Amino acid sequence: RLFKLSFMSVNLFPNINEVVLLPHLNDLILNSLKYSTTAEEPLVYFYLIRTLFRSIGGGRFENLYRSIKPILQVLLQSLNQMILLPHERELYVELCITVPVYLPFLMKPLVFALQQYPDLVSQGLRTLELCIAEYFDPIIEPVIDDVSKALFNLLQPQPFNHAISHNVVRILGKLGGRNRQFLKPPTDLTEKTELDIDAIADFKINGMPEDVPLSVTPGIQSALNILQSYKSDIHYRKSAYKYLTCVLLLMTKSSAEFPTNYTELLKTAVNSIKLERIGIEKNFDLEPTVNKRDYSNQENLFLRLLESVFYATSIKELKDDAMDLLNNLLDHFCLLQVNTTLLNKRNYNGTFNIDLKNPNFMLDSSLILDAIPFALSYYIPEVREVGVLAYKRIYEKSCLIYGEELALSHSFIPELAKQFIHLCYDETYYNKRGGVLGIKVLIDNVKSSSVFLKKYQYNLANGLLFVLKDTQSEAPSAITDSAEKLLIDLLSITFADVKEEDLGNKVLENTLTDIVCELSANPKVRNACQKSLHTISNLTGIPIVKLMDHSKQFLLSPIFAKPLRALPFTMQIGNVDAITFCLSLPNTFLTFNEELFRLLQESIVLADAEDESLSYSTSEQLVQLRIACIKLLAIALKNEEFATAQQGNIRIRILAVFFKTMLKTSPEIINTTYEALKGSLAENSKLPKELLQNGLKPLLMNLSDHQKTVPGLDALSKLLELLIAYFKVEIGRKLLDHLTAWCRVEVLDTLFGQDLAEQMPTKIIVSIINIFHLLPPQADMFLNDLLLKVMLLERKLRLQLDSPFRTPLARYLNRFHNPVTEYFKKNMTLRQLVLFMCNIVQRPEAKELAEDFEKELDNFYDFYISNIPKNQVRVVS
Amino acid sequence: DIGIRKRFMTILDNSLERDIKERLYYVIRDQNWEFIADYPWLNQALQLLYGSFNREKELSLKNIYCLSPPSILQEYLPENAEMVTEVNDLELSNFVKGHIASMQGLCRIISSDFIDSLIEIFYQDPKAIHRAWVTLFPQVYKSIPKNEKYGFVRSIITLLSKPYHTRQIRTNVINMLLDSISKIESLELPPHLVKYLAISYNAWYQSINILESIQSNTSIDNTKIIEANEDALLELYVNLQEEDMFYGLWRRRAKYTETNIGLSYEQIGLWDKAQQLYEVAQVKARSGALPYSQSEYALWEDNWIQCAEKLQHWDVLTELAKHEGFTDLLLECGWRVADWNSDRDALEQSVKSVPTPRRQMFKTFLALQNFAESRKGDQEVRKLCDEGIQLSLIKWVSLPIRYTPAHKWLLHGFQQYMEFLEATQIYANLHTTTVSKAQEIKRILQAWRDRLPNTWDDVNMWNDLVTWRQHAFQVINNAYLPLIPALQAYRGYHEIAWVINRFAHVARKHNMPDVCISQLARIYTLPNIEIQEAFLKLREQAKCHMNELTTGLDVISNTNLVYFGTVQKAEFFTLKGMFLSKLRAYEEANQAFATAVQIDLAKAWAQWGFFNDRRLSEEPNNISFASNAISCYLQAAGLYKNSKIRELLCRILWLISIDDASGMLTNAFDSFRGEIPVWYWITFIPQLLTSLSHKEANMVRHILIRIAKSYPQALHFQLRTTKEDFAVIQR
Amino acid sequence: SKKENLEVLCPHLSNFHHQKFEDIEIPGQYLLNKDNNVHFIKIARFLPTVDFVRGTHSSYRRLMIRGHDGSVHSFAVQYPAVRHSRREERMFQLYRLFNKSLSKNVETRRRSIQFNLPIAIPLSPQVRIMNDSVSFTTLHEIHNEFCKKKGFDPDDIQDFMADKLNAAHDDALPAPDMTILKVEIFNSIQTMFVPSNVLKDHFTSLFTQFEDFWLFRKQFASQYSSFVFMSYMMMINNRTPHKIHVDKTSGNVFTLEMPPDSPIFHNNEPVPFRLTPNIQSLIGDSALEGIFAVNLFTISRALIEPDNELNTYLALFIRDEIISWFSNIIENPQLREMVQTNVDLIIRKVAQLGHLNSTPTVTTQFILDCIGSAVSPRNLARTDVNFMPWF
């Protein structure tokens, strides 16, 4: 509501600026989604964005969003499909509202929305209408079938809203030439699913000539519809259960006889399952038809008639009998599945292609087993929580009735495994997450008997492999977080026992080779790849030496086989970053990559202006590529003898590019480049050419005259960390008058009303005073010059109790502590300057200054008490 | 309230029999309450019918492709028999107790319990009930006695009659029963036209299934009943505007010979030929043919009306309408008459008299046309006249659910009603501002010049808008006509020529070109004699074009001007050459036709190529052939893109195929190397591979190089299938 | 089984599809001819749930593909076949090219003609990817399912049809050995084996609302119109219920597998076209007899109407098809002679269903009579039992 109150602001006085919002504006939503991607109840963060969108337009602030828009759009559309719940459809559908202009991508959900709610209907009605005196002619909009499907279904006269019709007419008749101009012969006949096709039961009545059969369960569509619906009467809900309670029961209740001499016979079958090579009878016998989709129709009933119940049990007020049935259902269905495994043992021990028996015409709980755990990848994660209790009570009863046999390994898992493997391969956000939680509860009761881990080795690794790879950025990272956590534990329990370079036979050899071949795609894929690599190398013996020796054979070719000027560098020099993740091992192909060096020289020497720079995503990748190139060039010089003596100082040419990185002027680039050149480069040599000079002197002329800015002053600041004697220390005192030149009182005249933070000279002045934090240590003239100019500004600012310079004071007294305490005792009279320190000393950066003044206090407590007869008014001061 | 609903119905439930055939009769007669606005208590009636259902608890059947056996497959693999005896692992024994005890408790199910369940389910379950009555209500008809069944069938048709009083009102109540009655396996003995009028009550198409079923169902009860059911369904398929059933059904229901022959002759659109065929059908219907029924007159009757309605001669149709016109006089009021009072008496007569919104549409129409004609007299009741659209909407939710072409008309008028009120302010402000504005009206005029229907839609429709357009264009003239002599549209509202020239292309298309003469005659007396309407009219007169061609030369000799563009006339000159070469006069025609394009600087140029190629088709000698082909493909290079230029290339490709090793024609092709064919030339490309493989790939190498250049990925996939096979067959 | 992990069965994602990129144009969505690829679709991400289904004659593997559009235009997979493909690719080109002109006319497009032959892309010289999606079945599936709705072994009919035929040779000595027996056997077929209206039966349970069966009536004429005009004008001869796939939600008809100058489908060895009676019993007695003739007549008139458009287009296909047939030998005039000789032959055969000249026949008689002639149970019994015409 604060933000909602904040939202109404520039609406309420549009003379009060949107320029107030304008810089924080386009920053906000992009971070908001970024935080929404990061959040742990993000629909809230989504809920703000609508409202913040919900009051704009007619105050011309279009041009700000003109970079931002497709990022929002493409993600929203991808979210829009992914929503898959309820309001988030409509909310994302309401988020289709935007400020005007273009894009058919917006046109895709419109018809999805223009009947997705009554609610939206007025809005998008304006949209296509306004989309229909200008270049609004060439509309090829072929979802026009479904657009026709909604729009004619929209028009309904009754008491419907008299305007709601009145738009719809003005819509439809506006294009009569386009009315049926692509209307189609109807192409959804679309009927007779087995959500419909019930059967009959031989009922009875008190007038009847015979046991007149009555068709049970026509209500299934509505019986599904009523129960899952929120607003049910509890009686109505209970009946929706109770009607379904007879129903899927009766799908096998008539077949639910309790066999008497089968418990020994299944124990005999347990001995017969303990037997193997159990050959079958001599049959080349017959077989009827199937048309097993009609059986799957009957299955998809019992699929849905079951998956309803788990999706009903987790709902409140009726879980009690539900789980009891569900326990009893598992009590029946698993036992029949064991008989079905024995039936699958009768349906086993085939030899070679001759014949078999294959009896027909029954049903079994195999798909019924296969369904509901694969249906645990749903919404309402209490149903996902009961899905944990499934595979628990499954593997409970699995070891209860067959133990830890390989026949017991045959009995339950591979059904649940391969589906969970295939579900891991699947392509929905909500579908994929249900596998991953399933993988964990699997991993508890499977690591004991890890022959399935021997079975699923290159399998389940490859399942993890795409899982981080393929899943899109719509998801919150918690699935990707739950990914690597089980996965490191997976590569743990895999590589927990074999720890030599000796047990390297087949499966882990194939698995690690994919892990090596994965190392090249997404940075989040790239990042935990090395983390899984350098840790798996760290334990179990064979380090990144041995493992990336196999990768050294694997990465000797594509480091030059898919060449540069193509093969996009982020993954590509990510492989060199993987070779930089192999550079901590001794052998990383640690010389002879002059093809990799010289092309990357041209990759950085590709100019950021008047060049391939006219074509936010291209900006982000050119940020990413230049950062990757600046890292890989710097690591190449930093690599052991790879470019330290190769061509002499390749680092200095990389420092020339690092100087060009300083002119590249991106702070996020400059922070990486400064910290790489500080924390990973060490060169102390000479570059006295104009390359140092045309960076050095024009940047100060850029700040003093061209006012350029916050990166530009920070470039020469980081140069002052780097280039020792960036000479003429008085140029900063000349910059100080130049800072005074840029801080004439016209900005103070501009300061009448406006926020001083928004004062870009004050934004310049903060950066200017940030620079003299690390001036050469003759900051004695700094004590004379700036402090007066700060106070003379501050009274001209009419400011108190809060400074722009809270840090530049804090660094300067830290660095200059001797003239600090000197001038402090030397300025022992005046209160205003004293308070300026008294605030700044409260600021905690300089800490030795405080104890120094704590020493000087008892000196000054005398010295002012000495100074007691001085003025009798300033004495009171 | 759940208890209040249940107990009040229970009081009705216990105070009843358990005798279904009585109770169904007690349902079918012995309460016939309306409860009309919501629902039936067919819910409660099925419960009342379940009052006679036994409260049993067995309820089984064997057809779900039933489940696993308890012990059969546990006794079907008999090899390795342990069969242990008092040596049970307790995990086997404890589990075997529980699920059998779980089998002992859980399977408790009754039929009356589910009957209780589905009832409260049906408390909020509409579509289940539509499933529900179709389930039970046929099976109740089994246990019924034959005599009372005939009485119940009367009682059911009487039960069809009693909500035929109750106006219950796309949600099915009757239709709920009706389709539940439709699959009752032919137990509806008279109700042929009874269903026919019942069809427009609500939900057409569920009924029409029952009707076409009886016409196949073999019953001789009357051949009249065979004829009657034939009549009623012949209405309903025509009632839903479905054409091919109607001209389909009667042509397979014919008696007279021209009746069969005319029916096909009309439905294809050969409307003039049907009229004479119906005429001799009528003269023979002045008959000795005794058994003629009301079809053969009335089918012949409105056929005369439709033939009158179609082309022209509306005055003679008004002469036909004089002693006639149930509303054809009001359709003759649709013929152009701006006499306000005479229509007003007609309108008030017409407004006195579920179809005909066109009544209320016309009632608005002249009243709108009058209100602005009193120049800025009114517009407010025209906004009240938008309520006519509000009634007009009630149609488009009555009968269909899909887009049955009932819509295809009902949209076309729903287009107009807005176009009227669109014009209304557009009229009044024009009356205001004339009392700049030439441009502002040129917006809404070009807009209504734009919003024009589909070019193959319906001849009646495209006429009816062309009518309503010019009537506004009259008032458009009628404001412009005094004001320019009042001052002294720079010169001439030439607007309706666009409605004229368009209908001309439509008339040549929809194939009755007599009205194309009738429209072109009306074009004569007009202002705006300057070049712009002249360039439209020469485009109109060429669209208006042996005896007809020599009159075109007679049109060439003295008519409008020779100051205008000669390319249009040279197109007529080469078409006169195309008429001249139609008489096989090749050389005089083509040289004029080559000169006609040479003055023009192209559809004639391709046609003159095509004529010279038709001359090449007649002349297998290459001399005419290579002369035509380089000219024609270059004329095809002159031909427009985004057309059937592809087939023009295709014959040219066939002609390049048809070269049969002539020689030197490709040098003519390479010199006349043409601009971009590629995206149009993209479809014949796999063929273009094989001939370039076969022979003479000179310009074909010139063609395909640029082709793969700007078309990757379509060149790629097939040729990767192809060229890898090609050299492997070559080697 | 029916499905397995497709691209997961590849480690391609880290060696070659570690260069998965470039988001290629939708496969063959330039073949459905238009001007230029304005907004032609781009394939984005292969679905992983591949399906492999096996029909009565063959097997098919299926591959969904949800693209940058985002809807599964699931092209299916055909294992390598023979130069019939190089023929059938050429033919499917040809009948496409007229279909836009079929839309160009008035009453065809006002009644929705739309010839509708599907797309199919070969990618290797080996492998052929047809654009076959789910839920489009063919009749022999139903025809066996009809027999297997019962216990009726269709071979047991085929043996019994063969049984009485050799029994005709034995007891007495008739001269119309085929004719009396096929009159007897088709009756005996309609006695004990497949009667008609099985086709009416199965498809009536197929939709759920009868207006959709009434819809399913309306389409199933309109496609099966075009099979006839495809049959006669190509002079196709072999039609079998495992060669006409029908669209069980839309209603189209997908038909695969389709001197005297080596007449390779030039003359037709039995006279009529396909009008099978169980299919006729589902055809809807009035309305298909109402529509389909009116359909083919409209097809007859409008397509033949414009200037040489049949001809120059047939100049493409026929001059090709003969050069294929003679290679199955060439000549510079004799081909062009046999071109124009056959070109006149088909165009006159096109005009055989042409018109009535001055005396008004009610229909196109050669349509109207052959409507009876294909309906005629003699000429229907006259052909072989290959086409399962007992059904």
Amino acid at A807: T
- B271 - beta bridge partners? none
CB of B98 within 8 Å of a chain A CB? The answer is yes
Chains that touch B (3 or more CB pairs under 8 A): A, C
A816 in helix, strand or coil?
coil
- Helix segments in C328-376, DSSP class H: 332-352, 365-375
Residue C135 backbone zone (phi > 0: left; psi -120 to 50: alpha; other: beta): left
What's phi and psi for A62, nearest 5 deg? -65, -45
Question: At which residue do the structure tokens 């000196």 appear?
Answer: A859
Structure tokens at B598: 């040479």
- Helix segments in A798-847, DSSP class H: 807-815, 818-826, 831-842
What whole-number distance in Å separates Cα of residue B199 and Cα of residue B205? 8
CB of B216 within 8 Å of a chain C CB? The answer is yes
What does B158-227 look like in DSSP terms, one character per residue? HHHHHHHHS------SHHHHHHHHHTSSS---S-HHHHHHHTTTS-HHHHHHHHHHHHHS---S-HHHHH
- Using CB atoms and an 8 Å cut-off, which of residues 628-667 of chain B contact chain C? 641-642, 644, 646-647, 650-651, 653-654, 657-658, 660-661
Is residue B5 within 8 Å of residue B123, measured between CB atoms? yes
For residue A363, the chain B residues in CB contact (below 8 A) are 64-68
- Helix segments in A519-647, DSSP class H: 523-538, 544-556, 558-561, 569-580, 594-605, 617-638
Sign of CA dihedral B264, B270, B274, B277: negative
Q: What is the DSSP letter of A824?
A: H
Q: Do B273 and C35 touch (CB under 8 A)?
A: no
Amino acid at C250: S
**Contacts for B427-434: CB closer than 8 Å, 24+ residues apart:** B427/B372, B427/B472, B427/B475, B428/B372, B428/B376, B428/B379, B430/B476, B430/B479, B431/B372, B431/B375, B431/B376, B431/B479, B432/B376, B434/B479, B434/B480, B434/B483
Count the residues in chain B.
731
For residue C215, the chain A residues in CB contact (below 8 A) are 186, 189
Is residue A417 within 8 Å of residue A456, measured between CB atoms? yes
Residues 6+ apart with CB under 8 A from B131: A218, A219
- Using CB atoms and an 8 Å cut-off, which of residues 275-304 of chain B contact chain C? 277
Residues 6+ apart with CB under 8 A from A500: A541, A542
Q: Do B124 and A226 touch (CB under 8 A)?
A: yes
Strands (E), chain C: 3-5, 45-46, 49-54, 59-62, 65-66, 76-78, 120-122, 128-130, 136-138, 245-247, 253-254
Task: Find the closest chain C residue to A464 by CA distance.
Answer: C8
What does A494-530 look like in DSSP terms, one character per residue? HTTS--SSS---SHHHHHHHHHHHH----HHHHHHHH
- Helix segments in A375-456, DSSP class H: 381-401, 406-411, 413-425, 429-446, 451-455
Structure tokens at C352: 């055989």
Q: What is the DSSP letter of A441?
A: H
For residue B267, the chain C residues in CB contact (below 8 A) are 294
Sheet holding C59-62, edge to edge: C3-5, C49-54, C59-62, C76-78, C128-130, C120-122
Q: Best mutation site among C1, C2, C5 for testing chain A: the one with the most A CBs within 10 Å?
A: C5
What's phi and psi for C312, nearest 5 deg? -65, -35
What whole-number distance in Å separates Cα of residue A625 and Cα of residue C89? 47
Q: What is the DSSP letter of B619?
A: -
Question: Which of B23, B69, B95 is closest, CB to CB, to A400?
Answer: B95
Is residue C80 within 8 Å of residue C128, measured between CB atoms? yes
- C54 - beta bridge partners? C59
What whole-number distance in Å separates Cα of residue C359 and Cα of residue C157? 48
**Contacts for B118-121: CB closer than 8 Å, 24+ residues apart:** B118/A219, B118/A243, B119/B43, B119/B46, B119/B47, B119/B50, B120/A235, B120/A236, B120/A239, B120/B2, B121/A219, B121/A222, B121/A223, B121/A226, B121/A236, B121/A239, B121/A240, B121/A243
Give how far C243 is from chain A: nearest CA, Å: 20
CB of C88 within 8 Å of a chain B CB? The answer is no
Residues 6+ apart with CB under 8 A from A48: A3, A32
**Entry resolution in angstroms?**
4.6
- Using CB atoms and an 8 Å cut-off, which of residues 220-279 of chain C contact chain B? none
Cβ atoms within 10 Å of B610's Cβ, excluding its own: 24
Experimental method: cryo-EM
For residue A559, the chain C residues in CB contact (below 8 A) are none
Q: Do A254 and B100 touch (CB under 8 A)?
A: no
Task: Find the closest chain B residue to C126 by CA distance.
Answer: B721
What's phi and psi for B606, nearest 5 deg? -65, -40
Sheet holding C253-254, edge to edge: C136-138, C245-247, C253-254
What whole-number distance in Å separates Cα of residue B409 and Cα of residue B376? 32
Among residues B716, B401, A852, B694, the alpha carbon closest in space to that of C27 is found at: B716
**Contacts for B525-533: CB closer than 8 Å, 24+ residues apart:** B526/B492, B526/B494, B526/B497, B527/B491, B527/B492, B527/B493, B527/B494, B528/B491, B528/B492, B528/B493, B528/B494, B529/B492, B530/B491, B530/B492, B531/B564, B532/B494, B533/B492, B533/B494, B533/B497
Task: Find the closest chain A residue to B383 by CA distance.
Answer: A166
- How many helical (H) and strand (E) elements, i.e. helices and strands, does chain C have? 13, 11
What's phi and psi for B53, nearest 5 deg? -85, 145
Q: Do A226 and B394 touch (CB under 8 A)?
A: no
Chains that touch A (3 or more CB pairs under 8 A): B, C
Is residue A545 within 8 Å of residue A585, measured between CB atoms? yes
Q: What is the CA radius of gyration of chain C?
A: 23
Question: Which of B21, B68, B103 is closest, CB to CB, to A207?
Answer: B21
What whole-number distance in Å separates Cα of residue C163 and Cα of residue C165? 5
Question: Which of C5, C144, C216 is closest, CB to CB, to A422?
Answer: C5
Question: At which residue do the structure tokens 């099966």 appear?
Answer: C224
Q: How far is CA C35 from CA B145, B370, C29, in A?
A: 70, 49, 12
Q: What is the DSSP letter of A201?
A: B
Sign of CA dihedral A806, A810, A811, A812: positive
Among residues A197, A189, A190, A191, the alpha carbon closest in space to that of A294 is found at: A197
What whole-number distance in Å separates Cα of residue C375 and Cα of residue C277? 8
Among residues B545, B59, B140, B591, the alpha carbon closest in space to that of A202 is found at: B59
For residue C75, the chain B residues in CB contact (below 8 A) are none
Amino acid at B274: A
What whole-number distance in Å separates Cα of residue B412 and Cα of residue B432? 30
